[PDB]
């Protein structure tokens, strides 16, 4: 029952690569962020389709290109925070109230393609980079907890990653066609996170030492045959896509194999379904899910939206809805649902923004 109620276009006329509703709220009007050009912009959704422009953060570098953003809580205030990053490879932590950049993190050797916050710890930020590595940061103490990468790490750009429900493991994916599992609930990694919270550089002389994780706990190149540019956990299953007009639902190992008994040598995968669509041949096209993971939405390169209902007994039984508008014809780079699932926003290569209300 989604209906398109409004649209608009940002003044820079550059691609909007990312959009995220803030779910780290009190509910408080529904706010979302868009990222494109060298800026991030906040909007507030109101009655009768109204999309109210708030305030932007514009990078001082006119050559910066923001690709991705992610929301969390400020653990010192309970107000939200917004992390943004892109081609410069610099993470900026933004106070969304004032749009001030309150701190930034340098380190990645190239562009940052995705940011994700831990599902249970609002201070733990994951970044994935063109430099072939992932990094885990603690934004409360400004520490680098771990770097995931090496010869057995990704061999090309990492494009996407996702924490599982518990925040016990990460699945990453990228241009080397592979999906890789990184467990972060080992005794060593839990101890390193504890140490990151104990670290105060004014109280000690040591720098904070990061964990160097060179080997994934599972890896496969048998799901897709091209760049893998979006991945999400669905319980113990994985949803991932490449630029081959399909989202694949799969799991490591054989059908009855538990995800936590999977060993790094595991050679098998099981495919539980595949959701096909059309005209999504370019890479860097991301799907999103609602808060409950009842729904999945993906835009294609000519402005069509696909929305799958996952509230069915098995993944391959997902029910698909399509959403089209005769004036929406540019590539849709990302979608986002409001926390109450009542609004769906899509953002486009022509800097346009589309609001769909349930």
């Amino acid at each position: 029952s989604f209906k398109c109620v409004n649209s608009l276009k940002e003044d820079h006329n550059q691609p909007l690569f990312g959009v995220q509703f803030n779910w780290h709220s009190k509910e408080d009007p529904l706010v979302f962020a868009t990222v494109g050009s060298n800026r991030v912009t906040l909007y507030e959704c109101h009655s009768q389709g109204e999309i109210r422009l708030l305030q932007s953060y514009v990078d001082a570098d006119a050559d910066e290109n923001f690709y991705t953003c992610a929301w969390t809580y400020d653990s010192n205030t309970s107000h939200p925070l917004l992390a943004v990053a892109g081609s410069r490879g610099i993470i900026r932590i933004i106070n969304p109230i004032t749009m001030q950049c309150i701190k930034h993190y340098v380190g990645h050797g190239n562009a940052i393609n995705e940011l994700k916050f831990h599902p249970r710890d609002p201070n733990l930020l994951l970044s994935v980079s063109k430099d072939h590595a992932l990094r885990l940061w603690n934004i409360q103490t400004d520490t680098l907890v771990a770097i995931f990468g090496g010869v057995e790490g990704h061999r090309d750009e990492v494009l996407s990653a996702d924490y599982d429900l518990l925040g016990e493991k990460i699945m990453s994916c990228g241009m080397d066609h592979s999906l890789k599992l990184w467990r972060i609930n080992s005794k060593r990694m839990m101890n390193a996170i504890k140490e990151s919270y104990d670290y105060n550089p004014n109280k000690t002389n040591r720098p904070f030492i990061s964990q160097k994780i060179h080997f994934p706990d599972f890896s496969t190149r048998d799901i897709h045959r091209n760049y893998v540019d979006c991945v999400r956990w669905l319980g113990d299953l994985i949803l991932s896509k490449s630029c081959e007009n399909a989202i694949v639902c799969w799991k490591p190992g054989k059908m009855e194999d538990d995800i936590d008994k999977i060993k790094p040598s595991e050679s098998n995968v099981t495919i539980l379904g595949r959701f096909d669509y059309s005209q999504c041949d370019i890479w860097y096209m991301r799907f999103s899910m609602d808060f409950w993971q009842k729904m999945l939405a993906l835009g294609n390169q000519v402005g069509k939206l696909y929305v799958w209902d996952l509230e069915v007994e098995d993944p391959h039984k997902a029910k698909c809805t399509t959403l089209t508008h005769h004036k929406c014809g540019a590539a849709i780079r990302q979608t986002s649902f409001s926390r109450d699932s009542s609004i769906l926003i899509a953002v486009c290569d022509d800097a346009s923004i589309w609001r769909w209300d349930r």
């Binding site: 041949d281 370019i282 890479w283 860097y284 390169q301 590539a331």
Partner: peptide
Amino acid sequence: LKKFP
């Protein structure tokens, strides 16, 4: 592949 159509 291409990033853009």
